[PDB]
């Protein structure tokens, strides 16, 4: 139901934030995909319909 | 009643901001309180159809303490400008500026003036000086003591303020050398009769509020 | 939207280690 299962299934089951990197700028390009995938997992559509009540009040 | 706790907190809050006004800047008076009281009094005065008025009976308190406190507070402030000028002269002259201390006794007479009326304004009692409208009638004698002591206190405070202002100018009495201080003392002596005549006329016009059994 | 840059430059710089990270972010992609 939650987006944490889709985010853990996508991020935790896709590449795992690894492992190869380029030979030039491997620090920014290596650590950029982990933070971008971490923020993209944080934007996983975790909105209402678990405790939501529309048209309030 | 609420008039006792409201008049006490308003009287303490007025003397607090009034005393802190001439002092160092730590607190200021509420300037919006006059427009708020004027707009609130004028708004509730017009609407609705009614006559606004407070109705106490005597209140028993402010006459004897207000007369002696108003007379002592007014008499105690007059010697500041005179003593600062008389000691402010210094070694400039051995003249009458060190022998004109008789005005300080005239300013000191304003402390007894009104305090003697407050001593005479209570006979064999300290909570109520006369009959009040709580168990008896005729509360006008206790009601008029507040206005009589306030008028005698304000008159003694104004006479002591005028005597102190005349004594401060009567301290030096000369802008140049070869001057006489008797001319300033002659006009300063004429302002001391306002406290005695205002205290006798104020105490005689107010009647008496003592001898309450 | 500079509150994230101010908070990340002030508060985020203390636990990690000024305007050195903003110049280092643009200079990182150049080199």
């Amino acid at each position: 139901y939650t987006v944490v299962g889709v985010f853990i299934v996508v991020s935790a089951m896709s590449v795992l934030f690894w492992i190869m990197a380029p030979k030039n700028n491997q620090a920014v390009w290596r650590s950029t995909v982990i933070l971008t995938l971490a923020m993209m997992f944080l934007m996983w559509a975790i909105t209402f319909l678990c405790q939501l009540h529309p048209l309030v009040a | 009643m609420n008039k006792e706790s409201k008049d006490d907190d308003m009287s303490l809050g007025k003397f607090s901001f009034s005393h802190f006004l001439y002092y160092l800047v730590l607190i200021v008076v509420i300037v919006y309180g006059l427009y708020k009281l004027f707009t609130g009094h004028g708004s509730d005065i017009n609407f609705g159809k009614f006559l606004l008025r407070t109705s106490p009976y005597m209140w028993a308190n402010l006459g004897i303490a207000l007369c002696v406190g108003l007379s002592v507070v007014g008499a105690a402030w007059g010697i500041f400008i005179t003593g600062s000028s008389m000691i402010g002269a210094g070694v400039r002259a051995p003249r009458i500026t060190t022998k004109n201390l008789i005005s300080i006794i005239f300013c000191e007479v304003v402390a007894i003036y009104g305090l003697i009326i407050a001593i005479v304004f209570s006979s064999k009692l300290t909570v109520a000086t006369a009959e009040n409208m709580y168990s008896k009638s005729n509360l006008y004698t206790g009601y008029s003591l507040f206005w009589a002591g306030i008028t005698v206190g304000a008159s003694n405070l104004i006479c002591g303020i005028a005597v102190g202002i005349t004594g401060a100018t009567a301290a030096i009495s000369d802008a140049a050398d070869s001057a006489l201080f008797v001319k300033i003392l002659v006009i300063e002596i004429f302002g001391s009769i306002l406290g005695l005549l205002g205290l006798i006329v104020g105490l005689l016009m107010a009647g008496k509020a003592s001898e309450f059994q | 939207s500079a509150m994230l840059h101010s908070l990340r430059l002030h508060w985020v710089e203390s636990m990690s280690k000024p305007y050195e990270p903003f110049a280092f972010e643009y200079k990182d992609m150049e080199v």
Binding site: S31 | - | A2, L4, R8, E20, F22, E25
Partner: protein
């Protein structure tokens, strides 16, 4: 701040734009105007 590899603020390039982008599709005009600066970077 003359370090060779670290530290110079390498995490600000990911944490900076990701946390800064959350305050704002309004991002389409910023993506178009930012995309015009790629071709307009030389001139």
């Amino acid at each position: 701040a003359q370090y060779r590899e670290i530290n110079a603020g390498l995490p600000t390039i990911v944490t900076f734009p990701f946390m800064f982008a959350i305050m704002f599709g309004h991002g389409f005009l910023m993506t178009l105007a930012a995309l015009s600066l790629v071709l307009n970077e030389k001139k």
